[PDB]
């Protein structure tokens, strides 16, 4: 049961899961350029839907989850530069 890489505390380049749930859709991939507020992925928490937004302008570095993967609070979803 390999533990998932967590998002680093206070590292605003890393987006971690805010609550347990799962990944519905991934809207972006490694390399893309992105803008503050832009949608990056959608996740479910007790069947409510959340859209993960970019914290600022920058370039996606990598994804760390796959479609329909389960996630716990603090799990690292995506890194940005």
């Amino acid at each position: 049961v390999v533990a998932k890489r967590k998002a680093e505390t206070g590292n605003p380049n890393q987006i971690g899961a805010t609550m347990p749930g799962s990944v519905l859709e991934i809207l972006v991939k490694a390399g893309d350029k992105v803008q503050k507020g832009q949608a990056l992925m959608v996740t479910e928490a007790m069947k409510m839907e959340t859209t993960i937004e970019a914290p600022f302008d920058g370039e996606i570095v990598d994804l760390h989850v796959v479609k329909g993967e389960a996630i716990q609070t603090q799990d690292l979803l995506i890194e940005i530069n």
């Binding site: 805010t18 609550m19 928490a45 007790m46 609070t73």
Partner: protein
Amino acid sequence: REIGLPAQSEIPLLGSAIQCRITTEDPQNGFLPDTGKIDTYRSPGGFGIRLDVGNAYAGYEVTPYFDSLLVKVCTFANEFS
């Protein structure tokens, strides 16, 4: 006679008071109530301050099942300002 309230015209009117409810509603995320563990909870006091606490203490896990209220805060003073 027994509870000790005076007649209507003698019911005191002392200054003014304000109540705010502090909740986990996130005003930058459409007032969606946040959930998760409370790391730190320091409550103020002093003259003119009344607190009626809900569920908020260091270590408490705010769940998605109930309302988002952490604490009710009232202030009171001779003058509204």
